[PDB]
Design a protein around this ligand. Structure first.
Ligand SMILES: Nc1ncnc2c1ncn2[C@@H]1O[C@H](COP(=O)(O)OP(=O)(O)OC[C@H]2O[C@H](O)[C@H](O)[C@@H]2O)[C@@H](O)[C@H]1O
Ligand SMILES: Oc1ccc2ccccc2c1-c1nc2ccccc2n2cccc12
Ligand SMILES: [Zn+2]
Length: 282
C-alpha cells in the first residue's frame, strides 16, 4: 500500500528527430490503412497536455514522490479539456477506423470527450463514475466522485433500488473490472494492430494487453516519450509528443479533429460516418 511497487520512474525521454518522426507517422498511417481491426491503448501521457500530470514521467506523481516533491496540476479534473489526441480518437471511432479503446486513465476525459462507452474499457475506473453495489448501474457525474478504493460515496441508487453507490477507483489490491477486462482482452486478441499512446506499459494485466495482438500475426505500435516495458516487441516505436503524432496522422488520413462541445456522455456508438478512400499501398 505504502510499499506498493510503483515500477521504473523518471526514465529519460527520447525525441525522434523531425524527418525520422515524419517517416514513422507515415508508416503508422500505412498500418492503419492496412488493418481490419485497430485497438488503441491509452495511459496518462495522453492527458499531460491538458494539465494533468502522468505517473512515471519526469514530473509524474510517483517520480516526484521518489525525489520528495509534489506533482503539479494546471487544471482540475472538472475543468480539464480533452486533448487533440482525445478528440482524434473520437473521430477515428466515428469513421470506423478504431474498433476498441482500452484506457488505464481514471481522469474521465474519454467519456467526457463524447467517446462511446460501449467501445471503451476503463480498466482502472473513472473518477466521475459511481456504481450501485446492488444492481451494478453506473452514473456518470459532472463532478468527481469524492472517494477512492471502491468505497461508499454517500449517495443511493435511483433505479425504478436504494443500493449504496460506490466509486470505481481501484486500489493497489483491487482486481480489474471483469467486464472491461474481458472486452479489452477480446479486442486485443482479435485486433491486427494495437497502437499504445502515453503509457509506459508497466502495469499488468493492463500493459500486457497490447502483446496479445502479437499472437496471430498482429502488429504493435508504441507512441511514447519514454521507453516502455514492451519496446522490444513493438514493430514501430514513435518517440514524440502524442498530440503532434496524432495530428500528423489524422492529416495523412484525411480526417478533421472535431470540436469538443463541452462534457457529454455517449452510451452507445452512433452509426459510422463516411471516411476518405484508402491509398494504394504497393
Ligand atoms: N505528451 C506526451 N506525448 C507522449 N508521451 C507522453 C506525453 N506525456 C507523457 N508521456 C509519456 O507517457 C507515459 C505515461 O506512463 P505512466 O506515467 O506510467 O502512466 P500509465 O498510464 O502507463 O500508468 C499505468 C497506471 O499506473 C499508475 O499506478 C496508475 O494506476 C495508472 O493507471 C510516460 O512513459 C511518459 O513518458
Ligand atoms: O488517484 C489519482 C487519480 C488520478 C490521477 C491522475 C493524474 C495524476 C495522478 C492521479 C492520482 C494520484 N493518486 C495517488 C494515490 C496515492 C497517493 C497520492 C496520489 N496522488 C497525488 C496526486 C495525484 C495522485
Ligand atoms: Zn441499484
Amino acid at each position: 500500500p505504502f510499499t506498493a511497487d510503483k515500477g521504473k520512474c523518471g526514465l529519460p525521454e527520447i525525441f525522434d528527430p523531425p524527418e525520422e518522426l515524419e517517416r514513422k507517422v507515415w508508416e503508422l498511417a500505412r498500418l492503419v490503412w492496412q488493418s481490419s481491426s485497430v485497438v488503441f491503448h491509452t495511459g496518462a501521457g495522453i492527458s499531460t497536455a491538458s494539465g494533468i500530470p502522468d505517473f512515471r514521467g519526469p514530473h509524474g506523481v510517483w517520480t516526484m514522490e521518489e525525489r520528495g516533491l509534489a506533482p503539479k496540476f494546471d487544471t482540475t479534473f472538472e475543468s480539464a479539456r480533452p486533448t487533440q489526441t482525445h478528440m482524434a480518437l473520437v473521430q477515428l471511432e466515428r469513421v470506423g477506423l478504431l474498433r476498441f479503446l482500452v484506457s488505464q486513465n481514471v481522469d474521465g476525459l474519454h467519456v467526457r470527450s463524447g467517446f462511446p462507452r460501449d467501445k471503451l474499457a476503463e480498466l482502472h475506473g473513472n473518477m466521475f463514475v459511481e456504481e450501485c453495489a446492488k444492481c451494478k448501474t453506473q452514473y456518470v457525474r459532472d463532478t468527481v466522485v469524492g472517494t477512492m478504493g471502491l468505497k461508499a460515496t454517500g449517495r443511493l441508487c435511483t433505479v425504478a433500488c436504494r443500493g449504496e453507490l460506490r466509486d470505481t477507483i481501484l486500489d493497489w489490491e483491487d482486481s480489474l473490472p471483469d467486464r472491461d477486462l474481458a472486452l479489452a482482452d477480446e479486442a486485443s486478441r482479435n485486433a491486427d494492430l494495437s497502437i499504445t499512446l502515453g503509457t509506459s506499459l508497466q502495469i499488468r494485466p493492463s500493459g500486457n494487453l497490447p502483446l496479445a495482438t502479437k499472437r496471430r500475426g498482429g502488429r504493435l505500435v508504441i507512441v511514447n516519450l519514454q521507453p516502455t516495458k514492451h519496446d522490444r516487441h513493438a514493430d514501430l516505436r514513435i518517440h514524440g509528443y502524442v498530440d503532434e503524432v496524432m495530428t500528423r496522422l489524422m492529416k495523412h488520413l484525411g480526417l478533421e479533429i472535431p470540436a469538443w462541445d463541452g462534457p457529454r456522455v455517449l452510451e452507445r456508438a452512433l452509426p459510422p460516418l463516411p471516411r476518405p478512400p484508402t491509398p494504394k499501398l504497393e
